[PDB]
Design a protein around this ligand. Sequence first.
Ligand code: CLA
Ligand code: CLA
Ligand code: CLA
Lengths: 37, 74, 161, 739, 74, 80, 62, 29, 139
Amino acid sequence: FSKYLSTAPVIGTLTAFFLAGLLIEINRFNPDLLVYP
Amino acid sequence: GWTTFYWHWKHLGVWQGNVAQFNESSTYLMGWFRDYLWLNSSQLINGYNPFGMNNLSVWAWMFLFGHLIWATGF
Amino acid sequence: DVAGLIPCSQSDAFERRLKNTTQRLENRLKKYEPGSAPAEALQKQIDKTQQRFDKYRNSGLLCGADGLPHLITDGRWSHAGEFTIPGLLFLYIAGFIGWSGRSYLQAVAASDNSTEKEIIIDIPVALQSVSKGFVWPLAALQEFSSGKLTARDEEITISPR
Amino acid sequence: KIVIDKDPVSTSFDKWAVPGHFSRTLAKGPKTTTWIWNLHADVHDFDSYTSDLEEVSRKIFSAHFGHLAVVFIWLSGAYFHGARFSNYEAWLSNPTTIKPSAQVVWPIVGQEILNGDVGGGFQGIQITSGLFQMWRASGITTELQLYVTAIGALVMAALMLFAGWFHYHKAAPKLEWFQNAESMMNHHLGGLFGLGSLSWAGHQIHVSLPVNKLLDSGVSPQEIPLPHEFILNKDLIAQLYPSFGQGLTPFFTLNWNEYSDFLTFKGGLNPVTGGLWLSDSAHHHLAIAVLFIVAGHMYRTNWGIGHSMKEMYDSHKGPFTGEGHKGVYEIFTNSWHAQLSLNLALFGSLSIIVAHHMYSMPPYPYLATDYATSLCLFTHHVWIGGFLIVGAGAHAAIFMVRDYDPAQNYNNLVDRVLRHRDAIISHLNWVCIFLGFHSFGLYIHNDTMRALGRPQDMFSDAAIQLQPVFAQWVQGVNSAAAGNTAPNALANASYAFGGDIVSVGGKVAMMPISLGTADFLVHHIHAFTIHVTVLILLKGVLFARNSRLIPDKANLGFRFPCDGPGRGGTCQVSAWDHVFLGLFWMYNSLSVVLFHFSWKMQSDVWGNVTADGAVSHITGNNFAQGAITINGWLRDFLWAQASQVIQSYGSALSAYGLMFLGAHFIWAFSLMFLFSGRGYWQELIESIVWAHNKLKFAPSIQPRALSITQGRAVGVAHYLLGGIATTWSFFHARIISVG
Amino acid sequence: EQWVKDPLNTRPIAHAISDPHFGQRAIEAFSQAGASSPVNISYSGVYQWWYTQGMRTNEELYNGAIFLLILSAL
Amino acid sequence: AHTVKIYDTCIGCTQCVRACPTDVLEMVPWDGCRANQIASAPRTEDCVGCKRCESACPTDFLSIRVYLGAETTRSMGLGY
Amino acid sequence: MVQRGSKVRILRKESYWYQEIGTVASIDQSGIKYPVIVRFEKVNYSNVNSNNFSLDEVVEVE
Amino acid sequence: LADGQIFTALAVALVPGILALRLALELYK
Amino acid sequence: TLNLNAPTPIFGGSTGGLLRKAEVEEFYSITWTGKSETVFELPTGGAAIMRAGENLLRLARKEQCIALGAQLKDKFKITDYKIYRVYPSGEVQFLHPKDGVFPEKVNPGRVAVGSNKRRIGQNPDPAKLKFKGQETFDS
Ligand code: CLA
Ligand code: CLA
Ligand code: CLA
C-alpha cells in the first residue's frame, strides 16, 4: 500500500501540506513577521 | 504600456499638485485599476451619452474603436 | 534619516492609521452583544492591530508622510533586519531545496532506471539525498574546487550553428 | 434478464503504483515529460485503450456511482455547513434583512474581515446559493435537521461509493443487460421520474405545506410543530386546509374536488413571500407523478406489450428522407459517445430553461426579493448550460470519428445529413453573417449617430423603432390567459408577461419585463452568437471524418493538432479544435446573455417600491435609451456598476475585489498560450536543459514542450477561468452592495 | 497668430473639420477654441516648437510650407 | 511546387513512402550495396507540403526533407 | 576502431544527441555507409533511442 | 492667409505631381 | 485506358464533390473491381456500394484517389485499384500504380530524382550563395 504513497502526486501535495502547514501556524503564533527583531 | 502608464499617472498627480495619490496607490495594482483606469475614464466615456455630446465624442468613439480592433486581432 | 522618513515612534503619520482602524471596528462592535461570539472576534481584532503597531514603534521603522514603513536596501547594518537577515534566512533554505534534488538526481540517475524514480520519490534515496543537502554551503565549495560540480562544454549538448 | 460476471477484478493496491496500467503505451514508463500530460488526458477516455464494448461499459456504470458519491459528499458539505456555520435559525426569524451566511472564515492573517456584520448574531461570508430558501421551502425549522441530513447524505455518499465497487469489482453486468434501453426508459421514467415527484409530493404535502403556510402567518420558527407531528396528530394538521379529516376517502371514491384546499391551481406569487404557492407545486409534482408513471408503461419488456424503438424508427421515413431513422436505434445502443452528446445537449439546454423559469416564476420564499440570490442562480445554470452544450458538440464529433459506421448507415438520416453538409453549413454561414450585420451593425450605426449627435438617426424608441411585435404579442397572449384559456388559474403563469407588480418587504418580487427597441436589439445578438456557436460546433461534427481538404480526417483521430503547413496550412483542422474554438464563442454567447439579464433586471425590474405604490429601480430605467449603443453598454453598465467591486477594499467584499483582479490576471495568462506556439517554447527548454545538464543534476526524464493541443487546451482553460471568474466577481460585488 | 498673443489660454487648432456625416450638434461641439468652423484642437506640440524657432506670423508658416514643397521638388 | 530532397542517410525502411497522402514518393534501388533502397521524389509537383513523410523517417535527423516552395492549385489541395 | 559495447561522444552536429554519451549497439560489417548503431540513454523528439552514425562520427571515451 | 496663395501652393504641389509619378514608374523599371 | 464510361456505384447525393474546377481544369478518376456488395465511406460523404465492376468514381483531387486506396486495401482487402487523371482537361492517365507494381515496394529501373548525396547540415550555407541562382538544398 505504501508504494502508492511514494508516487509523484501524493507526495507533491502532502509535502505541500506540511510546508504550507508550517507557514500558517507560525503566523497564527507570531503575527506580522515583517522585520527581523 | 507599463512605461507610459507610469509616466502618465504620475504626471497627473504632479500636474494637479497632489503627488500623494500616486505615491500611495501605485504600490498596489488596485490603485492602477481603480484610481487610474476607472477614475480617469469618466470624461472620455461620456463623450456622447443619451443627453448629448461634447468635444470628446471623437476620442470616445476612437476609444471604443480601438477596443473593437484590438479584439479583432485575437 | 536616509530617504526622508521620520523614525515613526514620533510620527503623526503612523498614528493616524490606528484611530481609523480601531474606530472602524468599534463602530462594527457597538451594535453587538458584549457576551457574543463575534464580539471577541472584534475585541481581539483590535488587539491584533495593537500588537502589530507596538512591534513597529520599537523596531525603529522609517514611516513616511503616509504612515507606511518603507524599506531601505543599500544594506547598512542600521537597517539590516529589513532585508538582509531575511535574505540570509532565504538563501540557506533555498540551497536546501537546491541541493536536495541536486543530490537526489545524482543518486537516482546513478542507478538502473531513474525515469521511474522521478515518479516514485524514494525515501531510501530522498532521506539519503537531504543528508547531502544539509552540508550544502560546505559541499558545493569542495565540489567546485574538485571540479565535479560543473562539466566541460563538450559534455553538455550543443544546439547547431 | 440480468446476467453478471462475479468479481472480474479483485481488490488490489498493487496497480496503484503503476499509473497508466489501464493502457498499453503508458504501462512502460515515461521517457519525456509529456508522458505526464499524455497520461492525465486519456485517463477517463475509456474507449481509447479498451476494445471491449462490454468492459468499456462496466467502467462507466461504476464511475457514475462514484460521481453520485461526490455530489452526496458535496451535498452534505452544504447541509453540514448549514447547521453549524450558518445563521439559518436566525434567518427564519427574519428573512427580509439578514443575508444568508455560511463558510465562516478562520481568525487568521487578515481574512477575518470577510466575516463581516451580516446579521443575526453572526459573522461570516454572505452566500448567494439559495440553500436557505431551499431549506425554508423544504420545511426545515431547527438546525438539527440540517445535521442529520449531512450524515444522512454521508451514509448515502458512502453507500454510492460502495455500490460502484460492488458493480465492477464484485458483480459486473453484461452488455445484453446494458443494451436494454426500453426497460431502462420504463424504470427511469417510472421509478426515478414518476416516483421522484410523487415522493416529493409525499414530502411537500405532509411536511412542507403545513410549516410554510404557518410561516406566511409567521407565528414562530420554534412554535411551528415538528414535521413528524403532522402525520401522528390528525387534528393538528386538519386545522389548516381541513381535508385531512376526510382522509384518503375522497381520493378513493374519485371525488377529488374535496382537495381544492392544498392541491390547488392558485398560480401567482405568494404575496407575503414572493415565491410560488407551494400548494401548486404539490399539485404540480402530483400531476408530474401520474404523467411520468403513465409515461413509463410505454416501452416493451418481457410482457409482450409496449412500443419497441427498433419498430418505431423504421416506418418513420418519408419521401424527403429516404430510409428515415433506419439504424438510428442501432446507434444509441452501440455508442456511448452518441449517447453522451444527446444526453448533454438536452441537459445544458434544460438548465438554461431552469435559469429562465426561476427568475420569472420564483419557486422559493424570499428568493425573489433577495437579489443577491435570484441573480446568481440564473447566471450559474446558464453557465453550466453552455458548457454542457459544448460537451454535446464534442462527443457528437467523437461519435463521428470513432463510432459512426457507413456500413450500417446507408441512405438514412446520418447518411443524408453528411451527404448535404455543405448546404447546411453554407446556409448557416450566411445566417451567421446576416445576423451579425443586422444585430451588431445596428449598434455601430447606433454608436455613430450618438457620436455624431444625430439621435433622430439612431435605432431607439424615440427614433427609428425596431419594435419586437412577435415578442409583444406572445407576452400579451400569455398575460391574458388566466380566465380565458386557463380559467382555473387565479392569476397568470407569471407576472413577467403582464399584470400588477408584487412586493415583499420593500423590494419587488416580480413585475412585467417590457420589450422595446432596446430589447429587440439585444435578443438578436443572442440569436447571432448562438448561431455561430452552432456553426463552429456543427462543422466540427459534420466534417469530422473527411472534407474536401483532407479525405482521411477520420484516420488522424479526434484530437490531433494539425496536418502541418501543407495546402497553405492546416492548423486546427481537427474536431477537437472546433470544440476548442466554440468554447470562447460559448463564452461570448453566454456572457452577453448575463449582461442582458443582469442589466435589464436592475434598471427595469428589480428595485425598491414606495409605500405610495411606484417603483424606483436600481440603475434607473437606463436600459431604454442607454443600452442601444456600446458606449452606453460600456459606461452605464460596465464602468458604472463595477464601482462597487473595485471599491471593495477594506470591507467584507474585499475578497471579491482581489478575484476581480485575480481573474484579470489569469485571463491575461491564457493569452500567452493561444498567441504562441510549440516550436518557440521547445527551444527555450534546449537552452535551459543545457543549463541543468551544466551543473550535473539533469533529470533523466528529459523535459519537452507541451503538445500543441495541450498548449491550446491550457489557453482556453485559463481563458474561461479568467473570464468567468471576472464575471463571477463582478456580479457578486455588484448585487451584494445594491441588493 | 492667435496662439502667439497668449500661449496660456488659447487652444492650438490642428485643422478644420469637414465631415459631411456631422449633425447639427456635431458642428457646435467641434467648433471650439473660439472658432466659427469645426476644428480639432492640436496636441502635437508643433506650435511650441515653431514659436521657439522664431515664426510669429501666419505668412512665416506659409513661407515654411512652400519651402518644403520646393525641397521635396528637388 | 515544393522541393523534396532525399539525403544519403536513408535506411530503406519504406516508412516515408507509405506516409505520403498524394503518392509523391517511391523507393528506388540503391547501388552502394545493391541490397538496400533509397526514397525518391519523382512527382514533387503533387507535394502538398503536409510533412507526413518527415514524420515517418526513423533516423535521428531526416533522410527526406520538405522545403516549401512555389504554391500551385495542386499543392493547395483545391477541389475548386 | 570502435567495437560494440562502447561509450561514445557525438560530432554529428546536425543531431539532437550532439556531444552526448551513447552506448553503441552494433556495427554492420559490410560496406553500407553510416554503420555505427548507437543507442542512447536519452530519447529524441520523435521518440527514437538509436541511430546510425559513421565510424568517423563516433569517439572512444572509455 | 490669402486666396491666391492657396491656389498657388496647389500649383506648387503640382511640381511633386508629375515628378513623383516619374520617380515611381522608373523605379518600377 | 480509362474505359469511360465504366459504371459508377449507385450513389445519388453529395453536395461536396466534383464542382466547376472539373469542367475547366483537371478532374480525377479511380478504377477498381469490387469483390462483393459492401459499402464504403466516400471522401465526399459516406456510402456508395462496391459493384461487381468496373467501378469508377470521378473524385476531386489526387489526395482523394490515394486516400481511398489506403482505405480500400485495409478494409476490403482489394489491391487492384488503378487511379487516373483525365483526358482533354487533365494531364496524365494512370498516375498510380506508376510502375504497375505498388511504388511503396522497390523495383528495378526507377530513377533517383531529388537525391542529395550529403547530410542536411552538410548543405551549403545561404550566406555562401548570396546573389547566386544555385538552390541551397539542391545538388
Ligand atoms: C457529461 C459528462 C461528461 C463525461 C463523462 C465526459 C467524458 C469525456 N470527455 Mg467530455 N465534455 C464534457 C462532458 C463530459 N465529458 C463537457 C461539459 C465539455 C465541455 C468542456 C466536454 C468537452 C470535451 C473535450 C474537448 C474532450 C472531452 C473528452 C472526454 C473524454 C476524456 C476526458 C478525460 O479523461 O479528462 C480527464 C480530466 C482532465 C484532463 C481534467 C483537467 C482539467 C480540466 C481540463 C479543466 C478543469 C477546470 C476546473 C474544473 C476549474 C477549477 C480550476 C482549479 C482546479 C484550479 C471522456 C470520454 C476528450 C476526448 O478526447 O474524448 C474522446 C476531449 O478531448 N470532453
Ligand atoms: C416536469 C418538470 C418539473 C418542474 C418544472 C418542476 C418544478 C419544481 N420542482 Mg420538481 N421534480 C421533478 C419535476 C419538475 N419539477 C422531477 C421529475 C423530480 C424528481 C427528479 C423533482 C424533484 C424535486 C425536488 C426534490 C424539489 C423539486 C422542486 C421544484 C420547484 C423548484 C424549481 C425547480 O426545480 O426548477 C424548475 C425545473 C425545470 C423548469 C426543469 C424541469 C426538469 C424536468 C426533468 C423536465 C421534464 C421534461 C418535461 C416532460 C418537459 C418540459 C421540458 C422543459 C420545458 C422543462 C419547482 C416547482 C423543489 C421544491 O420543492 O421547491 C419548493 C425541490 O426541493 N423537484
Ligand atoms: C470583436 C472582435 C471580433 C469581431 C468583429 C469578429 C467577427 C467575426 N467573427 Mg470572429 N472571433 C473573435 C473575435 C471577433 N470576431 C475571436 C476573439 C475569436 C477566437 C475565439 C473568433 C473566432 C471566430 C470563429 C470560430 C468564427 C468567427 C466568425 C466571425 C464572423 C461572424 C459573422 C458576422 O457577424 O459577419 C458580419 C461582420 C461583423 C458583424 C463585423 C463588424 C462589421 C461592422 C459592424 C460593419 C462594417 C462597417 C463598415 C462597412 C466597415 C468598412 C468601412 C470602410 C470600408 C470605409 C465575424 C466576421 C465566424 C464566421 O466566420 O462565420 C461566418 C466563425 O465561425 N470568429
